[PDB]
Amino acid sequence: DVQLQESGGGLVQPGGSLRLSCATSGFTLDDYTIGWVRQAPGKEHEGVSCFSPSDGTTYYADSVKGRFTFSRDNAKNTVYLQMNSLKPEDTAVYYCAASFADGSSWCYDYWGQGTQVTVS
């Protein structure tokens, strides 16, 4: 079955950088939309990025455009979130999330355990 595991969270300075990794098991990346969703206690979850293999587009939340960048290592089946210019409001648990690429949902059906990012 689809399984995801995030890593790389921690405490980072204001305006700093951090690179999260999501390792996968059970599928090839090109069959799925994949990306990142975050949730801070007290707020509903917020999509951060989502990648579609139908045309290779990555969608980003307006709040992170230009600061956060998604990438994949297709051979290693691992995806990444490169965060730059971190702000205190970026503090949240970050999940990598995926859906089978059939047009009905996107970065929704499966998620990992999450990794905490805390910005001072």
Numbering used by the authors: 1 to 120
Quote what the paper states about this structure:
In this study, we present a comprehensive investigation involving the systematic humanization, experimental validation, and computational analysis of two llama‐derived VHHs, previously identified for their binding to NKp30 and their potential for natural killer (NK) cell redirection (Boje et al., 2024; Klausz et al., 2022). These VHHs, designated as VHH1 and VHH2 in accordance with our prior research, exhibit atypical Hallmark signatures (VEHG and FARS), with VHH1 additionally featuring a non‐canonical disulfide bond. During this process, we successfully determined the co‐crystal structure of VHH2 bound to NKp30 and obtained the apo structure of VHH1. Interestingly, our findings suggest distinct mechanisms underlying antigen binding and conformational stabilization in VHH1 and VHH2, determined by specific residues.
Despite efforts, a high‐resolution complex for NKp30‐VHH1 could not be attained. Using Colabfold implementation of Alphafold2 multimer (Jumper et al., 2021; Mirdita et al., 2022), a binding hypothesis for the NKp30‐VHH1 complex was generated. Remarkably, the predicted binding conformation of VHH1 closely resembles the experimentally observed x‐ray conformation of uncomplexed VHH1 (Cα rmsd: 0.66 Å, see alignment in Figure 2a). VHH1: The AlphaFold2 predicted paratope of VHH1 comprises residues from CDR2, CDR3, the framework region (Trp118), and all four residues of the Hallmark signature. According to the predicted complex, there are no direct intramolecular interactions between any Hallmark and a CDR3 residue. A 3D alignment of the predicted binding modes of VHH1‐v1.0 and VHH1‐v1.10 suggests that this loss is due to the G52W Hallmark residue mutation, which induces unfavorable steric interactions with NKp30. Notably, VHH1 possesses Cys107 in CDR3, forming a non‐canonical disulfide bond with Cys55. To further elucidate on the role of Hallmark residues and the non‐canonical disulfide on conformational stability of VHH1, we performed MD simulations on VHH1‐v1.1 with and without the disulfide bridge. Figure 4 shows the free energy landscape and root mean square fluctuation (RMSF) analysis for the CDR3 loop of VHH1‐v1.1 for both variants, demonstrating the substantial increase in CDR3 loop flexibility and conformational diversity in the absence of the disulfide bridge.
